[PDB]
Structure 1
Amino acid sequence: MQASQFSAQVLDWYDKYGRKTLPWQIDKTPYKVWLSEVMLQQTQVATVIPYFERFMARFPTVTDLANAPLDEVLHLWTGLGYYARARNLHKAAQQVATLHGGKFPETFEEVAALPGVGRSTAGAILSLSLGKHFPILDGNVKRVLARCYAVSGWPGKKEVENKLWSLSEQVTPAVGVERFNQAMMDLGAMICTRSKPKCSLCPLQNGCIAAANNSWALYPGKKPK
């Protein structure tokens, strides 16, 4: 499957099966996408949705979040777990208020420099909210690409991570990047699941090596020892 076929297939699927009615998909902005990405990274969507809504109501802009006392932020976070995310969230908001005039930055290096934001989260923020042409590589994406392309290694190894980023870059289009990147996360979350993926429901099933060999359990590699 040529990379142009991969993204065409994924975009066609997203058109007919995607949903873009999550609250961080309505009236999308860099702030909303960042907030949602941080919440989602160690929490399931069903649980995040009411927290997202409460945070957007209490903190309509990144400057409101920055000016709030940290204890109020932690209190609103209560129940999401992994509170280093909340502490980095608040620091990042403060850095946006201080360094960027309260306007969430729209260029990659400035986004990636925020506390709590890595390369994938920065490309997610800018691709999903502004259609900028960046690939992503969260756990969902890693599982889809590692299965399709038979990446055996543990992504905790630098060369394996690098191989996965190269594959992501290869399949990520510029045209329709916001749809493609949302679709890849939705696929990884709902279809290409950690256990017993639903390959018959997958738009990649015709080219996926794991599907061909019923070998999804091999990919990605797990932590060796």
Structure 2
Amino acid sequence: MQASQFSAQVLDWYDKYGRATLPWQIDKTPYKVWLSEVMLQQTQVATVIPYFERFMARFPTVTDLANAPLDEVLHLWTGLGYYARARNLHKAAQQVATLHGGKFPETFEEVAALPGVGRSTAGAILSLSLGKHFPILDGNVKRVLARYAVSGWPGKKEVENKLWLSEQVTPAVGVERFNQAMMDLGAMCTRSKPKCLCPLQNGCIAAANNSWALYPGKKP
């Protein structure tokens, strides 16, 4: 499907079903988006909501998080699992306080340099909070794009580079809505039995061939 049509269809879909009412989607700031992305990396949205609210109440700013004892951060994280995220979260907060005077960085390199934040997460933080022109590529997005019929295992460098398709379909105008739409689409284009309610159904190769099971490829 033509890139221009891909982004246009996803944006039109988001405008009608794009439920952007979650806490981290209102009065967005790099800090709030970063915090939510880290919590959402390996935890379901329903579970994350109360923690996000608790964290924002206890740590209104990144400096408050940086100055808090690690033990307190880990205690509040209890129940989210995958604590390496919490440890990196605290280190990143301290890096922001130390290197950026407490102002969460708004430039890609400085964001990506934070512990626990990669190319995709950095792109998400800046695109969603400031509308900066960056594409994303998490598990949800890989699924949607792979189902352009990319059958290789994303674990392979060449396949990962191929998927990073994301750049081609991601627009600058409306990037915040498009990136959120892609994540919503992949989360609600599911692993099993996708609900091809999808704005890409008229051009998706997997849908046309009823072959979604082949994309993305599984670890060989």
Q: TM-score under structure 1 normalisation?
A: 0.97
How much does 1:38 deviate?
Answer: 0.3
Distance in structure 2 (CA, Å) of the matches to 1:161 and 1:51: 32
How much does 1:130 deviate?
Answer: 0.1
Q: Structure 1 vs Structure 2: percent identity of aligned residues?
A: 100
Distance in structure 1 (CA, Å) of the matches to 2:129 and 2:159: 28
How much does 1:131 deviate?
Answer: 0.1
Distance in structure 2 (CA, Å) of the matches to 1:78 and 1:84: 12
How much does 1:158 deviate?
Answer: 0.5
Distance in structure 2 (CA, Å) of the matches to 1:175 and 1:114: 27
Measured against aligned partners, the alpha-carbon deviations of 1:90-124 in whole angstroms (never above 9, x if no partner) come to 00000000000000000000000000000000000
In the other structure, the counterpart of 2:83 is 83
Distance in structure 2 (CA, Å) of the matches to 1:61 and 1:128: 18
Cα RMSD (Å): 0.3
Measured against aligned partners, the alpha-carbon deviations of 1:33-71 in whole angstroms (never above 9, x if no partner) come to 000000000001010000000000000000000000000
How much does 1:218 deviate?
Answer: 0.3
Distance in structure 2 (CA, Å) of the matches to 1:52 and 1:158: 34
Distance in structure 1 (CA, Å) of the matches to 2:212 and 2:50: 33
Distance in structure 2 (CA, Å) of the matches to 1:53 and 1:195: 31
Measured against aligned partners, the alpha-carbon deviations of 1:136-169 in whole angstroms (never above 9, x if no partner) come to 000000000000x00000001100000000x000
* Alignment size in residue pairs: 220
Distance in structure 1 (CA, Å) of the matches to 2:118 and 2:18: 26
Distance in structure 1 (CA, Å) of the matches to 2:87 and 2:119: 19
* Partner secondary structure for residue 85 of structure 2: helix
Matches within 5 A, 1:1-225: 1-147=1-147, 149-165=148-164, 167-190=165-188, 192-199=189-196, 201-224=197-220
Distance in structure 2 (CA, Å) of the matches to 1:88 and 1:121: 13
* Partner secondary structure for residue 106 of structure 1: coil
Distance in structure 1 (CA, Å) of the matches to 2:203 and 2:62: 42
Distance in structure 2 (CA, Å) of the matches to 1:26 and 1:121: 18
| Structure 2, unpaired ranges of 5+ | none
How much does 1:20 deviate?
Answer: 1.1
How much does 1:194 deviate?
Answer: 0.7
Distance in structure 1 (CA, Å) of the matches to 2:33 and 2:6: 25
Distance in structure 1 (CA, Å) of the matches to 2:140 and 2:151: 16
Q: TM-score under structure 2 normalisation?
A: 1.00
How much does 1:187 deviate?
Answer: 0.0
Distance in structure 1 (CA, Å) of the matches to 2:191 and 2:38: 21
Distance in structure 2 (CA, Å) of the matches to 1:63 and 1:72: 15
